[PDB]
Design a protein around this motif. Structure first.
Motif, PDB file in Angstrom:
ATOM      1  N   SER B   1       0.825  -1.202   0.000  1.00 10.65           N
ATOM      2  CA  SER B   1       0.000   0.000   0.000  1.00 10.65           C
ATOM      3  C   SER B   1       0.862   1.256   0.000  1.00 10.65           C
ATOM      4  O   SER B   1       0.367   2.365  -0.204  1.00 10.65           O
ATOM      5  CB  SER B   1      -0.932   0.004   1.207  1.00 10.65           C
ATOM      6  OG  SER B   1      -1.791  -1.118   1.174  1.00 10.65           O
ATOM      7  N   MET B   2       2.156   1.077   0.236  1.00 12.08           N
ATOM      8  CA  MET B   2       3.111   2.170   0.250  1.00 12.08           C
ATOM      9  C   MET B   2       4.274   1.866  -0.686  1.00 12.08           C
ATOM     10  O   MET B   2       4.318   0.827  -1.351  1.00 12.08           O
ATOM     11  CB  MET B   2       3.603   2.433   1.673  1.00 12.08           C
ATOM     12  CG  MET B   2       4.517   1.362   2.218  1.00 12.08           C
ATOM     13  SD  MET B   2       4.446   1.342   4.009  1.00 12.08           S
ATOM     14  CE  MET B   2       4.465   3.101   4.322  1.00 12.08           C
ATOM     15  N   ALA B   3       5.233   2.791  -0.719  1.00  9.93           N
ATOM     16  CA  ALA B   3       6.334   2.704  -1.669  1.00  9.93           C
ATOM     17  C   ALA B   3       7.349   1.645  -1.259  1.00  9.93           C
ATOM     18  O   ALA B   3       7.684   0.758  -2.053  1.00  9.93           O
ATOM     19  CB  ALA B   3       7.012   4.066  -1.802  1.00  9.93           C
ATOM     20  N   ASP B   5       8.816  -1.496   0.899  1.00  5.67           N
ATOM     21  CA  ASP B   5       8.348  -2.714   1.559  1.00  5.67           C
ATOM     22  C   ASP B   5       9.314  -3.116   2.672  1.00  5.67           C
ATOM     23  O   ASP B   5      10.078  -4.070   2.556  1.00  5.67           O
ATOM     24  CB  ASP B   5       8.130  -3.817   0.527  1.00  5.67           C
ATOM     25  CG  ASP B   5       9.404  -4.215  -0.209  1.00  5.67           C
ATOM     26  OD1 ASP B   5      10.472  -3.613   0.033  1.00  5.67           O
ATOM     27  OD2 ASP B   5       9.331  -5.139  -1.045  1.00  5.67           O
ATOM     28  N   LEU B   6       9.236  -2.404   3.793  1.00  6.99           N
ATOM     29  CA  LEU B   6      10.139  -2.610   4.917  1.00  6.99           C
ATOM     30  C   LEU B   6       9.967  -3.965   5.587  1.00  6.99           C
ATOM     31  O   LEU B   6      10.656  -4.237   6.572  1.00  6.99           O
ATOM     32  CB  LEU B   6       9.934  -1.509   5.958  1.00  6.99           C
ATOM     33  CG  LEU B   6      10.063  -0.069   5.481  1.00  6.99           C
ATOM     34  CD1 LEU B   6       9.659   0.868   6.582  1.00  6.99           C
ATOM     35  CD2 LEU B   6      11.478   0.207   5.052  1.00  6.99           C
ATOM     36  N   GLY B   7       9.069  -4.817   5.089  1.00  6.18           N
ATOM     37  CA  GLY B   7       8.852  -6.108   5.713  1.00  6.18           C
ATOM     38  C   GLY B   7       9.928  -7.129   5.430  1.00  6.18           C
ATOM     39  O   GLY B   7      10.021  -8.131   6.146  1.00  6.18           O
ATOM     40  N   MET B   9      13.399  -5.950   4.176  1.00  7.07           N
ATOM     41  CA  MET B   9      14.711  -5.348   4.341  1.00  7.07           C
ATOM     42  C   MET B   9      15.228  -5.552   5.758  1.00  7.07           C
ATOM     43  O   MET B   9      14.503  -5.376   6.738  1.00  7.07           O
ATOM     44  CB  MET B   9      14.659  -3.854   4.022  1.00  7.07           C
ATOM     45  CG  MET B   9      13.637  -3.483   2.971  1.00  7.07           C
ATOM     46  SD  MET B   9      13.536  -1.715   2.666  1.00  7.07           S
ATOM     47  CE  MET B   9      15.229  -1.359   2.217  1.00  7.07           C
ATOM     48  N   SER B  10      16.501  -5.923   5.857  1.00  6.24           N
ATOM     49  CA  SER B  10      17.128  -6.128   7.151  1.00  6.24           C
ATOM     50  C   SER B  10      17.324  -4.785   7.849  1.00  6.24           C
ATOM     51  O   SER B  10      16.926  -3.734   7.349  1.00  6.24           O
ATOM     52  CB  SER B  10      18.452  -6.863   6.986  1.00  6.24           C
ATOM     53  OG  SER B  10      19.373  -6.080   6.251  1.00  6.24           O
ATOM     54  N   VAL B  14      17.447  -0.982   6.302  1.00  7.44           N
ATOM     55  CA  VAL B  14      16.480   0.023   6.723  1.00  7.44           C
ATOM     56  C   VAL B  14      17.193   1.294   7.164  1.00  7.44           C
ATOM     57  O   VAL B  14      16.733   2.403   6.881  1.00  7.44           O
ATOM     58  CB  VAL B  14      15.575  -0.537   7.831  1.00  7.44           C
ATOM     59  CG1 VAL B  14      14.856   0.575   8.535  1.00  7.44           C
ATOM     60  CG2 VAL B  14      14.577  -1.496   7.246  1.00  7.44           C
ATOM     61  N   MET B  30       8.080   5.199   9.373  1.00  9.68           N
ATOM     62  CA  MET B  30       7.998   4.296  10.512  1.00  9.68           C
ATOM     63  C   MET B  30       6.583   4.280  11.078  1.00  9.68           C
ATOM     64  O   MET B  30       6.022   3.211  11.350  1.00  9.68           O
ATOM     65  CB  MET B  30       9.039   4.696  11.555  1.00  9.68           C
ATOM     66  CG  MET B  30       9.123   3.816  12.769  1.00  9.68           C
ATOM     67  SD  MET B  30       7.913   4.168  14.040  1.00  9.68           S
ATOM     68  CE  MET B  30       8.575   5.702  14.668  1.00  9.68           C
TER      69      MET B  30
END
Lengths: 174, 30, 174, 174, 48, 174
Positions: B1-3, B5-7, B9-10, B14, B30
């Motif tokens: 849903s956003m730019a 995908d921090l799910g 990335m280590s 990040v 965040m």
């Protein structure tokens, strides 16, 4: 952009060059070269922000193509799973220099519904929203570049007016 | 849903991502 | 991120450095380095909360896989004991860095019913509920980080405007 | 940084010096020496804040080394007590000029768990948060230093323009 | 390290002030001397 | 902390001092000395509350030592009367500046059971609960100290800005 390429000449050659010229035009070359260096810094900064705006406009164009595609599978009388992205959007996602991980679903081009195509549209038009990270990062620099560059144009000019008024006071044969 | 995908990335990716962005927009992601 | 690495230079070298520069640009370096130090603290804080959100999203994904598995052993015509977790959830529980003690029952992978699989789903999706321990712990710090970081941007800027207006008042040859 | 070292000459020697020079260049030396004194005060102030930022960056580096160490004892399959601080962090704590009392536990280097290493990381990265005590203490001084230093540059300059325009009005042989 | 064209404009604007003023003020004084030197000798008439 | 020690000079010397200075910097000294007096009051107030928190933390540490001692006489296979307080807790009770009357029983150090050691733990950890008597007593004072101290910083500053803008309007030689 100018006559003398002071970027290579050593110091003991720059001094002899300035002695060949006058004292006022040594100042005008020094200020003109400083102006070129500052303008090159600032313009090389301004071309790192057109990168952000170019990315935003291409992402918006792709998202609008996906919206044009949805506006025909939403009006579809059947079940809303007969849809494919237009051939340019596929090459947009599949290109490596974008990091545009979108769906997490198998086998794009055959085929993604009409209610999961909203995920593709959202993940494309969410990378178009990057014009504030390049305004937060670049406002205390343009401050100083804009101040210095003016402060140096208006100093080069003072030198030119003085150079004119100094030589106007020599009267020949009187 | 956003730019971003921090799910996946280590942490050391990040942090470099947040350094690429500002300090206020790191907080907004965040 | 800047020109001079003041993190190693001693005090008697920083003073000589600041004497080489002006008086206004010594202030601008001092404020820029203080801004870098504060931003590094705050960002290293912000990457300790993406840990919590990453854990929550992975736990939710695992719980949803277990729900997808139950939705086929609940609709099972036979007795509801023919079920195994999908191969990724097993590696989720068996991994050591999660402390995800769930069942207290023997020999996962063969096999856990459909009414004791609810225990696994609940014990996985109960570790996904950790976004309030990282909002209670981190609201009086972001207070001060956000106030200081603004209070320092707006002080660096004041210095730049003054540096511009001080040198604009020198007229050459007049 | 200038020709005459007025810091030692008595008053009855400064007056005779100023009589040797003109009346306008006595003013320019007086303003230049006042500018040097003010800039020395301000720069010696600016090097007492790089001390705070240097302490913050070194503390953050040490805390990040301790985090790198935890990220291998958290992923440890065994019980999470096999860990030692990297050899530079030990010399950081043991150094006397930091007052970094951390653990209250015996025999560092052998060995501190992985759940009590969090105490060391917190007590190191809690002394990195010192960039607001040096912004609260130093904002009503930089006010006056920045105002005066500009107010004195722009007064030295006025003197130089007047010195030029006074002598331009003498015409030789007319 | 390429952003160092303001430390050399802050440090060198009250000096170029005085160098530029003096250097003009001295060209225009050398010249006055030359015109006077010409007009002094023009007033000597030989054989009259 | 400042140049002039106005705490001893009489009134007819303070007036002559202020006449030696200007009219704006007399105001800045008056406000700076008022700020020092107010900050000294407030800080001497803040060090009467760290007394309460210091007492609470020492009492909690002693109570935790007594709990560590009970956790070995509760697990004692025999009758639960083989116990002594650790040697530091004895010096805690026996010290005169605490008023820590606890047991009413003879001959501490030999020896107090394990069910009457609960009385010692309770009477030690009941004097640790004193952080509300110092919040009820000190909230209508910090009100006024915090308001005044801000109200005086922001008045000292107004004086400094006016002092700058008054002298900026004097143009030399024009």
């Amino acid at each position: 952009s100018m006559a003398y390429d002071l970027g290579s000449m050593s110091k003991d050659d720059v001094i002899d060059l300035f002695n060949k010229l006058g004292v006022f035009q040594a100042a005008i070359l020094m200020f003109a070269y400083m102006y070129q260096a500052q303008s090159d810094l600032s313009i090389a900064k301004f071309a790192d922000m057109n990168e952000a705006s170019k990315e935003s406009t291409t992402a918006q164009k792709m998202a609008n193509l996906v919206d044009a595609k949805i506006a025909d599978v939403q009006s579809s009388s059947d079940k809303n799973a007969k849809a494919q992205l237009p051939d340019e959007v596929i090459s947009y996602i599949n290109d490596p220099r974008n990091d545009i991980t979108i769906s997490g679903i198998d086998n794009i081009n055959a085929q993604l519904g009409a209610g999961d195509l909203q995920t593709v549209k959202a993940a494309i038009s969410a990378k178009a929203n990057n014009l504030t990270t390049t305004v937060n990062n670049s406002q205390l620099e343009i401050q100083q570049m804009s101040n210095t560059l003016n402060l140096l144009t208006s100093a080069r000019s003072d030198m030119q007016s003085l150079q004119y008024r100094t030589i106007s006071g020599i009267s020949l044969g009187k």
